[PDB]
Amino acid sequence: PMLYIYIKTQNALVQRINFNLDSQELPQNILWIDLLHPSAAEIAFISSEFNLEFPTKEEREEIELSAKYWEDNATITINAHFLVRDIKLRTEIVTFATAKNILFTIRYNEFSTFEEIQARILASPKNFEDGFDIIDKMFEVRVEKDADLLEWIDKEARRLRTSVLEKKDEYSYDEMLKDISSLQELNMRVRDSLFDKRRAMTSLLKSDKIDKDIKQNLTIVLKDLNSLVEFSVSQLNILDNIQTILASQINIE
Ligand code: NI
């Protein structure tokens, strides 16, 4: 049950404070508040200090569980999509929220993609003026990590493509089918993860809480995201065709 507060320092750098809710005093110049394994104390803390609640039924608005983006006059909420090990992956969701120009992330597990997000924010030369600048950089880091995963699948697909097409350096036909099937699932999960981030960034673009600097950056990430979706689709066709060729060999032989 941990609470990390990221502040903009006097020297215009970011510093991470391991914050103790029950005793310590709140810092100045907060950029981003990270809640890991929150208990009712941490949930009570952000509500009492930043007016941040998450009921699924309220009087003022119809809350739709069939969306992953919600915005009222003061806050934006995003249930953001991540992939974590279950190689077999599974969906992990992190709640993002904005209040008083501060980014909030609420997470229930620690996973490697979020550690990479932490390291990049702490080491970026970018000057973050508020929490909206943070989420801007996070979307960029998240699309890169999805790209690295498509690249890894690409390496594995080329090895399989060579092995099956030229019938050279093959192993167990069943084992090759297991791998192809595993890569197909990874490809499908990353593409869907990329679709989720497209919908969120596009909804952020419409907010008037987001200044022109962030909208320009989200647009650049969106173009690259689209490139990765194209790459993922070409890649899945290759995997499906390797599976078809491999099944053809089993049956013919
Ligand atoms: Ni700005």
Coordinates of C-alpha atoms in Angstrom, one line a residue, residues 123-233:
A123 CA 14.6 11.0 -16.6
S124 CA 12.9 13.0 -19.4
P125 CA 14.5 16.4 -20.2
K126 CA 11.0 17.7 -20.9
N127 CA 9.7 20.4 -18.6
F128 CA 6.4 19.1 -17.1
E129 CA 4.3 22.0 -16.0
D130 CA 1.4 19.9 -14.7
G131 CA -0.1 16.4 -14.6
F132 CA -1.5 16.7 -18.2
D133 CA 2.0 16.9 -19.5
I134 CA 2.8 13.6 -17.6
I135 CA -0.1 11.7 -19.3
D136 CA 1.0 13.1 -22.6
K137 CA 4.5 11.5 -22.2
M138 CA 2.9 8.2 -20.8
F139 CA 0.9 7.6 -24.0
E140 CA 4.1 8.0 -26.0
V141 CA 6.0 5.5 -23.8
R142 CA 3.1 3.1 -23.9
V143 CA 3.0 3.1 -27.7
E144 CA 6.7 2.5 -27.9
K145 CA 6.4 -0.6 -25.6
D146 CA 3.6 -1.9 -27.8
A147 CA 6.0 -1.3 -30.8
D148 CA 8.8 -3.2 -29.0
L149 CA 6.4 -6.1 -28.5
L150 CA 5.4 -6.2 -32.2
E151 CA 9.1 -6.2 -33.0
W152 CA 9.7 -9.2 -30.8
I153 CA 6.8 -11.0 -32.5
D154 CA 8.4 -10.1 -35.8
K155 CA 11.7 -11.7 -34.9
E156 CA 9.9 -14.9 -33.9
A157 CA 7.6 -14.8 -37.0
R158 CA 10.6 -14.6 -39.3
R159 CA 12.3 -17.6 -37.7
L160 CA 9.1 -19.6 -38.1
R161 CA 8.5 -18.3 -41.6
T162 CA 11.9 -19.5 -42.7
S163 CA 11.6 -22.8 -40.9
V164 CA 8.2 -23.7 -42.4
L165 CA 8.5 -22.2 -45.9
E166 CA 11.9 -23.7 -46.7
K167 CA 11.3 -26.9 -44.5
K168 CA 14.7 -26.0 -43.0
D169 CA 15.7 -26.4 -39.4
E170 CA 12.2 -27.5 -38.2
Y171 CA 11.3 -28.8 -34.8
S172 CA 8.2 -30.6 -33.6
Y173 CA 5.4 -29.7 -35.9
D174 CA 3.1 -29.6 -32.9
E175 CA 5.5 -27.3 -31.0
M176 CA 5.7 -25.0 -34.0
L177 CA 1.9 -24.8 -34.0
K178 CA 1.9 -24.0 -30.3
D179 CA 4.3 -21.1 -30.9
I180 CA 2.4 -19.7 -33.9
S181 CA -0.8 -19.9 -31.8
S182 CA 1.0 -18.1 -28.9
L183 CA 2.2 -15.3 -31.3
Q184 CA -1.2 -14.9 -32.8
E185 CA -2.7 -14.2 -29.3
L186 CA 0.1 -11.7 -28.4
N187 CA -0.5 -9.9 -31.7
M188 CA -4.3 -9.7 -31.1
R189 CA -3.8 -8.4 -27.6
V190 CA -1.4 -5.6 -28.6
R191 CA -3.6 -4.4 -31.5
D192 CA -6.6 -4.2 -29.2
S193 CA -4.4 -2.4 -26.6
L194 CA -3.5 0.0 -29.4
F195 CA -7.2 0.5 -30.3
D196 CA -8.0 1.3 -26.6
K197 CA -5.2 4.0 -26.5
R198 CA -6.5 5.5 -29.8
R199 CA -10.0 6.0 -28.3
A200 CA -8.6 7.5 -25.1
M201 CA -6.2 9.9 -26.9
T202 CA -8.9 10.9 -29.3
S203 CA -11.2 11.7 -26.4
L204 CA -8.5 13.7 -24.6
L205 CA -8.0 15.7 -27.8
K206 CA -11.6 17.0 -27.4
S207 CA -11.1 18.2 -23.8
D208 CA -10.6 21.9 -23.3
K209 CA -8.6 21.0 -20.2
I210 CA -5.7 20.0 -22.6
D211 CA -3.6 22.8 -24.0
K212 CA -2.3 23.0 -27.6
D213 CA 1.1 21.5 -26.7
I214 CA -0.4 18.2 -25.6
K215 CA -2.9 18.0 -28.4
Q216 CA 0.0 18.3 -30.9
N217 CA 1.9 15.5 -29.1
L218 CA -1.1 13.2 -28.9
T219 CA -1.6 13.7 -32.6
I220 CA 2.0 12.6 -33.3
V221 CA 1.6 9.5 -31.1
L222 CA -1.7 8.8 -32.9
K223 CA 0.0 8.7 -36.3
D224 CA 2.6 6.3 -35.0
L225 CA -0.1 4.2 -33.3
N226 CA -1.8 3.8 -36.6
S227 CA 1.4 2.6 -38.2
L228 CA 1.7 0.0 -35.5
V229 CA -1.9 -1.2 -36.2
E230 CA -1.0 -1.6 -39.9
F231 CA 2.1 -3.5 -38.9
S232 CA 0.2 -5.7 -36.5
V233 CA -2.4 -6.6 -39.2

